[PDB]
UniProtKB/Swiss-Prot annotation, chain C:
Cellular compartments annotated: Cytoplasm, Nucleoid
Segments forming a coiled coil: 115-143
HTH tetR-type domain span: 8-68
Record-stated family: Belongs to the nucleoid occlusion factor SlmA family.
Annotated keywords: Cell cycle, Cell division, Coiled coil, Cytoplasm, DNA-binding
Phylogenetic placement of the source organism: Bacteria, Pseudomonadati, Pseudomonadota, Gammaproteobacteria, Enterobacterales
Protein name: Nucleoid occlusion factor SlmA
Length: 11, 190, 196
């Protein structure tokens, strides 16, 4: 399961 | 585009932070992205449009993953496990969006936002039931108890985990000791 | 009449509040205005019974954990069988929430969203005391029947707590359509199946 993360810690 | 996502990004972050438990303001939202209140309106007249977009992300992420599960896995119990793990995992990977899922973040906003969330749950639960009803034709033996009862039971456990996740300010994580917790949930499947 | 107008009137307010907490006013905001307009009095006069509002929810909360904790202790006294206790405790929580839709919104934390963080902390502690009371009951297993559970007692306690919160949350978002005790007799054997 590749659970998507709305928030990116590249920002 | 760039600004629009920025606003959404900051909202999700605000929902997950110490301000997440309080009413978000169009003013604060604008400040966090470094724009004026007027400029923010250019992209979103209200926070309602913002929540809509977030809820849409939630629907897509879960529903899409549930369909991939159903295709790559045929074993009923494994399907159920993956789906439950998906819901708990998603909540953990998105503390802010979880507060929307749990209905706390939507207390402030319009009632059709919560209505849309309830529909997502009814939807997931209907899928849960359909997966369960197919056990018979697939394994040669179905559940003794009512699939409706087992599905609600299964989703209730999820809402309970997420509810504690939210109220514990995200200290109590949903997927914690999942390998130990799941066998107990599966045992409830009769 | 100092005491038959001070508490007697201090009830018709908390009554209108509880109802408000579950009616439309539950979806939106509780205002000192709406609150007095229901009990047929002015703001300033509502203020006399309940000065602030942040402390006025404790009056309601503190009817909850008491009405809940005292029953749990009265359950452990009336019943000695471990399983039977956990069943009664879980039914207590469920049954109470069902008969008090408004108070449930407080339990689930939706009614506290508009209030300050002091309150959501009080409710967490309430769940702490319930859960801690679940473990204890579970730990008396060995001494009472011969053997304890094989699985960690905490895990089992939180698992039971999850079931309760899930049913309550579900009770709330469904707008009180899905009653927490509905099909409990069919549900409990499923929950109990976890206890070893």
């Amino acid at each position: 399961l590749d659970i998507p993360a709305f928030l990116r810690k590249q920002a | 585009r760039n600004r629009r996502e920025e606003i959404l990004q900051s909202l999700a972050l605000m929902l997950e932070s110490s301000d997440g438990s309080q009413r978000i303001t169009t003013a604060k939202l604008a400040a966090s992205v470094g724009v004026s209140e007027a400029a923010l309106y250019r992209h979103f007249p209200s926070k309602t449009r913002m929540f809509d977009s977030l809820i849409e992300f939630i629907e897509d992420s879960l529903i899409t993953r549930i369909n991939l599960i159903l295709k790559d896995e045929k074993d009923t119990t494994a399907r159920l496990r993956l789906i439950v793990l998906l819901i708990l995992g998603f909540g953990e990977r998105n503390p802010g969006l979880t507060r929307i899922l749990t209905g706390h973040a939507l207390m402030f906003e319009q009632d059709r936002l919560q209505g849309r969330i309830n529909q997502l749950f009814e939807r997931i639960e209907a899928q849960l039931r359909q997966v369960m009803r197919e056990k018979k034709m697939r394994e040669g033996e179905g559940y003794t108890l009512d699939e409706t009862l087992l599905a609600s039971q299964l989703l209730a456990f999820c809402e309970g985990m997420l509810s504690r996740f939210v109220r514990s300010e995200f200290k109590y994580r949903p997927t914690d000791d999942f390998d130990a917790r799941w066998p107990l949930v599966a045992a409830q499947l009769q």
